[PDB]
């Protein structure tokens, strides 16, 4: 067998199953050698009797039974993936020339479910051998594959090279219950907005475990629908100009260097950099205001100010210590490193509010974790264990690791206080993200998206990648939820206004409810 892929609760996400294939011998030669006929003798009534199961047009079955004088015939995709109780039903008809041959298929019980993480294994027609083409299935192919026991190698994750055979089972950190909430809410967003790109990830604030992840446009692993259009996994392989979500780190840097004072007033409005009026989202500003406010509002000028006070060279190092521009050394294939945009003053400035600079969504989880774990960034991981279920031998076992402490405990508490404000302030420009009964906090994340191949940015009515990096319960969270949407093709206006609030709210509410986190008032 190819090994199974389980969730954290032990529920199967992928497994091998035995299905069957219909074959009909149509040539008299078969029955020339003995008494009882071994070819279809009454095409007409055989076709009717078979019109009981599956793609039952009796005449279309007769067309196929009537074809040339080939020995044996198949029935396309309908003539495959037949269940065992379908087999039994036909076997009782005892028809001349009809047979079902066993074939193994990879089965994903949920169909479209974390499609881009789980991945998909393709079948070699001739041999019946399954081989991972994307996601888990590809990374862990050798271990999964009960056959390939020559020299087993973990794709790109250099090491663990442990050299009638059953395969190895892969245990993920995913919780099927939380994954449901994600898939449902993303379906909603696609219906509403029809974005070009979309993701949501739920991470355990205190471990770095990925509890749920999906993206649109994804594929259906079961059917092979849409597989190969978008190959890239958003979370690990695709880069984004993150936008205002990225200010959180620009702030932390400052707070620590002692350059940010929440009550100190700064000049908002415009900032002339390299012959360009880089201005706030409102284009006009709010004049002289406290920094605390600027951040609540998401002032682009604030971050630019703060960069100047701290210093270019020092801010670059700050973003590096927050794990950006480098792989998170997660368990996934060809994880994208992104890059800190720092070639000139323009790139540097635009970076502090999340342009020029590219990140993996994961880099961002890693960063954000700092604020709730006393300045320690947690390595985000999704693989709980790879173990042969016969021997119980663990070839890998995942655990929570500290990918760095860039910031202090004091700094983290002060950052959290501002994140609380961003949502729960009197003048909050992010009330849309508030939930009933539960205390939320996080950062709005509106960004311009780059032209796919060459040119500048995408233009249009609202050509924005909106995001929210939220956590709850406030101060001492259970989870981080990061949703991002790129280029809504429908209701682009509401998209800019609400952002991903319409997806974050349900996911977080449902998750907290399922994890039995206490409420207040309805």
């Amino acid at each position: 067998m190819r090994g199974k892929i389980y969730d954290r609760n032990g529920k199967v996400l992928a497994e091998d199953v035995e299905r069957y294939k219909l074959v009909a011998v149509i040539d008299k030669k078969a029955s020339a050698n003995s008494k009882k006929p071994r070819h279809v003798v009454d095409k007409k009534e055989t076709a009717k009797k078979l019109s009981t199961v599956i793609n039952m047009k009796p005449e279309e079955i007769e067309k196929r039974l009537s074809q040339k004088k080939a020995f044996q015939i198949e029935f396309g995709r309908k003539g495959t993936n037949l269940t065992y109780q379908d087999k039994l039903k036909i076997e009782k008809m005892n028809l001349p020339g009809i047979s079902l041959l066993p074939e193994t298929e990879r089965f994903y019980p949920n169909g479209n479910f974390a499609s881009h993480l789980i991945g998909r294994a393709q079948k070699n027609p001739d041999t019946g051998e399954l081989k991972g083409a994307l996601g888990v299935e590809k990374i862990f192919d050798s271990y999964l594959s009960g056959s390939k026991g020559s020299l087993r190698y973990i794709h790109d994750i250099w090491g663990y090279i442990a050299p009638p055979k059953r395969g190895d089972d892969v245990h993920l950190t995913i919780d099927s219950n939380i994954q449901v909430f994600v898939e449902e809410a993303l379906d909603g967003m696609v219906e509403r907005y029809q974005p070009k790109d979309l993701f949501a990830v739920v991470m355990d604030a205190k471990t770095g475990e990925i509890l749920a992840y999906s993206q649109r446009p994804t594929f259906n692993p079961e059917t092979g629908k849409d597989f190969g259009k978008k190959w890239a996994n958003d979370l690990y392989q695709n880069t984004y100009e993150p936008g205002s979500t990225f200010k959180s780190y620009g702030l932390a840097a400052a707070i620590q260097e002692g350059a940010f004072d929440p009550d100190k007033k700064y000049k908002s409005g415009h900032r002339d950099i390299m012959g360009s009026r880089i201005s706030d989202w409102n284009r006009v500003g709010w004049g002289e205001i406290p920094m605390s406010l600027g951040f609540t509002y998401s002032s682009n000028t604030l971050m630019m100010h703060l960069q100047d006070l701290v210093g270019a060279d020092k801010m670059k190092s700050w973003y590096e210590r927050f794990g950006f521009g480098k792989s998170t050394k997660g368990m996934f294939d060809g994880e994208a490193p992104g890059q800190i945009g720092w070639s000139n003053e323009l790139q540097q400035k635009t970076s502090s509010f999340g342009q020029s600079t590219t990140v993996t969504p994961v880099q961002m989880l890693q960063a954000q974790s700092a604020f709730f774990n006393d300045g320690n960034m947690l390595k985000p991981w999704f693989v709980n264990s790879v173990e042969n279920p016969v021997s119980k031998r663990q070839f890998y076992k995942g655990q929570k690791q500290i990918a760095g402490k860039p910031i202090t405990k004091d700094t983290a508490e002060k950052v959290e206080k501002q994140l609380d404000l961003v949502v729960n302030s009197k003048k909050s420009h992010a009330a849309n993200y508030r939930i009933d009964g539960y205390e939320v906090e996080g950062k709005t994340g509106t960004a311009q998206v780059a032209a796919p191949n060459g040119g500048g940015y995408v233009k249009g009515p609202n050509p924005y990648f909106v995001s929210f990096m939220g956590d709850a319960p406030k101060k001492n969270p259970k989870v981080i939820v990061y949703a991002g949407m790129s280029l809504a093709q429908k209701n682009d206006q509401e998209a800019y206004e609400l952002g991903v609030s319409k997806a974050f709210k349900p996911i977080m509410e449902n998750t907290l409810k399922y994890l039995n986190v206490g409420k207040s008032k309805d």
Binding site: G243, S244, D280, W281, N282, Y297, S298, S299, N300, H429, A430, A431, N432, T444, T446, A447, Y464, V466, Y496, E497
Partner: peptide, 5 residues
Amino acid sequence: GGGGG
């Protein structure tokens, strides 16, 4: 962006 509301 950042707000818008």
